Design an enzyme around this catalytic site. Structure first.
Site, PDB file in Angstrom:
ATOM      1  N   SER A 101      59.082 -43.510  38.323  1.00 40.82           N
ATOM      2  CA  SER A 101      58.451 -44.767  38.697  1.00 40.82           C
ATOM      3  C   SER A 101      58.364 -45.708  37.499  1.00 40.82           C
ATOM      4  O   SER A 101      57.965 -45.261  36.419  1.00 40.82           O
ATOM      5  CB  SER A 101      57.058 -44.522  39.241  1.00 40.82           C
ATOM      6  OG  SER A 101      56.673 -45.663  39.947  1.00 40.82           O
ATOM      7  N   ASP A 141      51.612 -52.715  44.528  1.00 32.54           N
ATOM      8  CA  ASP A 141      51.557 -51.568  43.631  1.00 32.54           C
ATOM      9  C   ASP A 141      51.913 -51.948  42.199  1.00 32.54           C
ATOM     10  O   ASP A 141      52.610 -51.201  41.511  1.00 32.54           O
ATOM     11  CB  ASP A 141      52.461 -50.446  44.094  1.00 32.54           C
ATOM     12  CG  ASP A 141      52.276 -49.141  43.343  1.00 32.54           C
ATOM     13  OD1 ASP A 141      51.154 -48.877  42.813  1.00 32.54           O
ATOM     14  OD2 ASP A 141      53.252 -48.346  43.278  1.00 32.54           O
ATOM     15  N   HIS A 197      50.196 -47.155  40.630  1.00 31.50           N
ATOM     16  CA  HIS A 197      49.853 -45.782  40.986  1.00 31.50           C
ATOM     17  C   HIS A 197      50.153 -44.777  39.884  1.00 31.50           C
ATOM     18  O   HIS A 197      49.674 -43.641  39.955  1.00 31.50           O
ATOM     19  CB  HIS A 197      50.570 -45.347  42.273  1.00 31.50           C
ATOM     20  CG  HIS A 197      52.040 -45.114  42.091  1.00 31.50           C
ATOM     21  ND1 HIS A 197      52.589 -43.931  41.660  1.00 31.50           N
ATOM     22  CD2 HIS A 197      53.049 -45.981  42.309  1.00 31.50           C
ATOM     23  CE1 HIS A 197      53.931 -44.121  41.631  1.00 31.50           C
ATOM     24  NE2 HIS A 197      54.228 -45.356  42.011  1.00 31.50           N
TER      25      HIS A 197
END
EC number: 3.4.21.90
Lengths: 149, 149
Positions: free
Chosen positions: B101, B49, B27
């Site tokens: 992230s 992901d 993402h």
């Protein structure tokens, strides 16, 4: 063979079934609006602005054929005719806009010859940025001044 | 073994060399800021992901080891300690935030135990959404209320 890509409830572009792949321009934000297509593994290439997943077997017959063959003349897309001359796809300025990336361009046999990425406004005509194929491999061709769609 | 991902000149998150793989949260927008890694083809899926590629030969020896072993206690990341209790990694709220992230969490032997995807604000503490290993296999564990970072 064409699926909407959506983000926050709005259509942002398209994915298409080409050969034996689900093809989506990488730059298009959002998720393909089919939960099973959205969950596939995609091979992503920054260089070609392309994400491609193996087509689900149940959909294999719905895919369009594709070709590297691009003689000069005119081709077909959702909005009408696409001219191809001097190695450039062009359309009338204003026919395409942001939201149209991922739409295919086809020959009269129904073979995909390109996937739209964007367009460069050159006055009366707009030159398209595309994914397209030579006899050996995929390529990305992007006119100067392209706005991504 | 840790690389920035960048978009429009801004750091958007991180990618890690772990085992045989370049591992990036799918993402996170942008491209890995490394000449070799940026030129690879990646496999991307919403399932975990993850966006991954095989580590180039030149970089293989820089990869971190990993483990499934997650006894309760504390682990290590960029900002300090990460608690692990009841199957959940937690940190103080506000220590991690959007932009973090892809950061790895390590044990004291330097093995990666998780890669951060996001965090669920639970008040004083935040529970991390992670990729982690169950035996030899990656898994994605996402607390209720997670925001992707």
């Amino acid at each position: 063979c064409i699926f909407e890509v959506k983000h926050e409830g709005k259509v942002t572009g398209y994915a298409c079934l080409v050969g034996d792949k689900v093809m989506k321009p990488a730059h298009v934000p959002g998720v393909i609006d089919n939960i099973d297509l959205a969950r596939l593994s995609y091979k992503k290439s920054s260089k070609y602005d392309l994400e491609c997943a193996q087509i689900p077997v149940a959909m294999k017959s719905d895919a369009s054929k594709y070709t590297h063959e691009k003689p000069e003349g005119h081709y077909n897309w959702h909005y009408g005719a696409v001219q191809y001359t001097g190695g450039r796809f062009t359309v009338p300025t204003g026919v395409g806009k942001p939201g149209d990336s991922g739409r295919p361009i086809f020959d009269n046999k129904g073979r995909v010859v390109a996937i739209v990425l964007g367009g460069a406004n050159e006055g009366a005509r707009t030159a398209l940025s595309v994914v397209t194929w030579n006899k050996d491999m995929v390529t990305k061709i992007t006119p100067e001044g392209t706005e991504e769609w």
